[PDB]
């Protein structure tokens, strides 16, 4: 129909009785889900989508800031101007699926093209009230608990020729990953388990898809070049605790066809994504902390400058969580029906 | 006279096939086993297998079993080698060679054919003159820029001029495209007197150039 | 499984050059492969000299130990030498010549008006017929050093006069190119007592 | 006493772009230059005037504060959402002819009982329709001493409206550009600590032999668990953990706030979404003139009676201003 920008509303299945933080935020923020939604296919039609200029992405970012403002309150928040102390309550933390919905007079177009690269024309289109359920999972390097590509791996970037612009990868087959900090030893020490055969195969498939976009070059995977730890490690939050995981064993040109162990630390001193600054959080809760997650996508950064061995080097990256939302919101735009 | 002539250099996308042909002249083709040997850039020689032209019967190295096919057409004295499911490490020069005796002495080799396994895509060279104004021996040449894949051959004056020619190895640019120079030192007296043309041939794109190099 | 020693060796013209191959016997054949060409069979059945090959090359064997000899190394003998038994081939021995220091001739080439009209500028410096192989070219624009701007390439050792030649290539956009006037390359070699500099005006 | 339709008058200016003026001119007649007070049993909890004003304030907001989306179970509604200049202006609600408005001049009327010093006036004083929870803003203060008002103090389910002797200042600000939703409130810890004891003291008079404790909200809608209000058209929600605290700081007190686009409406059951906040510095300096408290039920542990902020029913806000007024035929 007609592209337009407005204020969408969120719907979720949060429960008023549930003490978990995503629920608590959503019960106020969001209305309930429609049990039977109406999707109207357009047969042959063409619309242009731009995942990189999508007002829906910017809305989820402001939303996830609002969630974390309530869930994850740090003991000390450091800003260049100031240092601040506040209450540090531990909380129950498990991301729950969020739907973003169009109000009256507006609709959300959904691209059904099975392998849309995300900026350009869409062949198959439908109109919906709401997006699918998107879990606001904050993470770097590996994209977790998201949606998979229907047909084949897709590579998405604002400018592939520009090395500085992040690469969002969508996988064909998800790979399981389990990170656990066992019950009490070093209470900050943790580990992650990955099937090397499954991850090694996943890598080749993305490497092969990458080679199509750089036909000249050979494709190398390597450990992060450097920067803030949030980015140089696979960083995420599990049960309110911030995990930082060594993915040197993941981004390697020679990967083990065996079970892979990644070392992790629970960190109290972190760099915020929400704003530039540093936060200090409370020491971990007691007991077993575990996350069994689905790796469904990647965030990569390609090395700049002249290639030494006619090799293009790609290293895990991240940091701007909007890209995380783009990995899910690429196929939607808001249009005002007339 | 006694010779093996192979097909020209190739580029093929990964996962594709390449066929190399080898045509033998000046001996009885049926008499000797024909072998294929490949050589990756900068590396040593790797035997691929042999074919008996009487039988058409083959023997392939285990490394290539199920990927290589050796056939022959005794009617035109031609042996064929076909490698399937190419992978980038299959980029190499392929040679046909005659086994002279059961010493495995390969007395006769083809000039060898380069096979670049690569997803894309052929580009003809731009050929720019390297004019000479400096001085009793003057240097001139040809810049053969931005072509793909290897190889290009350069001669001067359609082969008449050979003394003092240096065709450099190609360097692989940051663009993935190759580039090389061919130069020649000539008598300075020659520069007004004599025409200088470099002949650049890039068969993978069927690009052929004659470029007069002017003061 | 095939061994070969040494990997490479330098030798003066006329020297006695000996190569060793380590493998039961028989049979053992020796090949010479020059740059860009196919192998050429020299020695077959360990000791037998192929027809039409100079008498200076020879081979010897005992058991599973073999050797290949050039009695008097000549300039055209720059090549790699391979032993082989049936399918298996040794990693090869690279033989290059040692010679008296030779200074390079130096020439520099402005970018062509052809290339300019397309928007890029390649400047080329030539080092011609020098020895040893070691050489150092650095680019100056208007007295300004450059880095990552250029690529260079070296010929194989010359079969007649045993020298090398070297090409160094300066590439930059037509925009940058016209933002300057004097383009120079500075060659440093053992043959040259003071480092030579060649240059021109845009 | 009779039930009728009063009419409102205000100091509205026809030229003013501020919305309370704009609504007031079409809705409201001018202030009477010459007011008459003529000296001569009430219920603030059963007063038709409150139900009238509530409709007015709904009406004000419908014209001033149109949310971009109104979310109701049946439906979504979308409408023009223009930002506006927002500063409540005092409204006088007046009796129609053949009717008069009685005024309690009583020194300390609890608001349910008999008033001795009564007067008749045509109009009520100017009341600002400040919509808020937990803290009462920009209203009227008690003349003599802090006043406790309830339908029943023995019934913990009935709200407690406290009217203050001496106002406490509160400044809430979103600084000029960081998280544009982030805001803060500044209150003098010394001023507030004294105020608490002076209200804690008054409370001990109704609950003898018990200690008086202040604690944070028990739970509910966010509107009620925080101190919520509108400042310059933007909706503030402020964490009063530092205010309802048995151990308040002598030092300066800073409350964390958020500017919220999604609110639960007090006008009706539903959710409204408003436009993102304006650019620039947003600040409200307000006078805290009263409290909305809820007393914990049950057998007392440690012999302490616990009180917590509450609200949500905006009628309770008007009852803090209309208590001394009754309509007569
Ligand atoms: C990607 O997505 C994946 C899936 O989509 C994510 O993986 C999911 O992760 C969530 C957790 O984030 C999992 O759900 C959780 O399961 C927890 C464990 O569930 C089992 O264990 C229960 C208890 O075990 C004992 O008791 C049973 C008797 O019933 C006995 O058999 C057993 O042997 C053992 O002794 C068991 O009863 C269950 O049925 C399961 O077997 C489960 O405990 C979690 O419940 C949490 O959270 C929920 C809300 O999510 C609450 O309703 C619960 O009360 C409980 O919360 C407690 O923990 C909080 C944090 O510590 C507290 O602060 C809470 O207030 C609460 O604490 C109370 O309860 C404690 C007693 O348990 C008391 O000690 C306290 O004082 C409080 O009373 C939850 O259901 C999914 O299982 C999992 N899915 C998969 C497929 O694995 C993954 O996380 C995602 N990754 C990312 C990055 O997003
Ligand atoms: C309480 O009343 C005063 C006005 O009586 C309000 O102060 C106004 O504040 C706005 C911005 O907040 C300013 O732009 C106006 O200039 C002020 N007007 C006056 C008359 O001072 C104050 O904001 C009110 N507080 C609340 C919570 O509504
Ligand atoms: C802020 O408010 C929330 C709920 O409104 C509450 O849980 C939290 O404890 C408050 N802040 C502090 C410091 O307690
Ligand atoms: C998944 O996509 C890849 C392309 O990256 C393709 O090679 C692979 O066969 C696909 N497999 C399935 C099951 O979709
Ligand atoms: C672990 O990560 C660190 C920092 O993120 C990195 O320097 C290191 O190389 C990784 N592990 C190993 C074994 O190198
Ligand atoms: C990482 O690389 C090294 C070699 O570089 C290898 O030995 C190691 O097993 C690799 N690990 C994984 C998990 O890929
Ligand atoms: C198995 O592991 C080796 C490295 O140990 C690797 O080279 C090979 O490709 C792997 N193959 C599969 C099918 O995982
Ligand atoms: C205000 O009232 C309180 C009790 O309600 C009393 O303690 C205080 O003295 C009074 N102050 C003034 C100035 O009237
Ligand atoms: C509120 O009380 C908590 C502890 O109960 C204390 O840490 C905090 O400083 C108090 N805040 C104020 C403003 O008194």
Numbering used by the authors:
A (entry chain G): 45 to 124, 198 to 301, 324 to 396, 412 to 492
B (entry chain H): 1 to 52, 52A, 53 to 72, 72A, 72B, 72C, 73 to 100, 100A, ...
C (entry chain L): 3 to 25, 29 to 207
D (entry chain I): 47 to 86, 92 to 124, 198 to 301, 324 to 396, 412 to 490
Publication passage describing the model:
The HIV-1 envelope (Env) spike, a trimer of gp120-gp41 heterodimers, is the only target of neutralizing antibodies (Abs). As exemplified by VRC01, the first such bNAb to be isolated, VRC01-class bNAbs share a common mode of gp120 binding in which the VH1-2*02-derived variable heavy (VH) domain mimics CD4. Here, we present crystal structures of inferred germline VRC01-like Abs alone and complexed with 426c-based gp120 immunogen cores and compare and contrast their gp120 recognition with structures of mature VRC01-class Ab/gp120 complexes.
3BNC60GL contained 38 HC and 25 LC substitutions in addition to a four-residue deletion in HC framework region 3 (FWR3HC) and a four-residue insertion in CDRL1 compared with 3BNC60MAT. As expected, the germline-reverted Abs did not bind detectably to 93TH057 gp120, but NIH45-46GL bound to both 426c.TM1ΔV1-3 and 426c.TM4ΔV1-3 gp120s with equilibrium dissociation constants (KDs) of ~0.7 and 3 μM, respectively. Crystal structures of NIH45-46GL bound to 426c.TM1△V1-3 and 3BNC60GL bound to 426c.TM4△V1-3 were solved to 3.4 Å and 3.1 Å resolution, respectively. The 426c.TM4△1–3 structure was solved using crystals of the gp120 core alone and again as part of the analysis of the 3BNC60GL/426c.TM4△V1-3 crystals in which the crystallographic asymmetric unit included two copies of unbound 426c.TM4△V1-3 gp120 along with two copies of the 3BNC60GL/426c.TM4△V1-3 complex. The new germline Fab/gp120 structures, NIH45-46GL/426c.TM1△V1-3 and 3BNC60GL/426c.TM4△V1-3, showed interface interactions in which the germline Fab contacts with the CD4-binding loop and loops D and V5 of the gp120 outer domain were similar to those observed for mature VRC01-class Fab/gp120 complexes. The 3BNC60GL complex with 426c.TM4△V1-3 gp120 includes an additional main chain hydrogen bond between Gly57HC and Gly365gp120 that is not made in the 3BNC117MAT/gp120 complex.
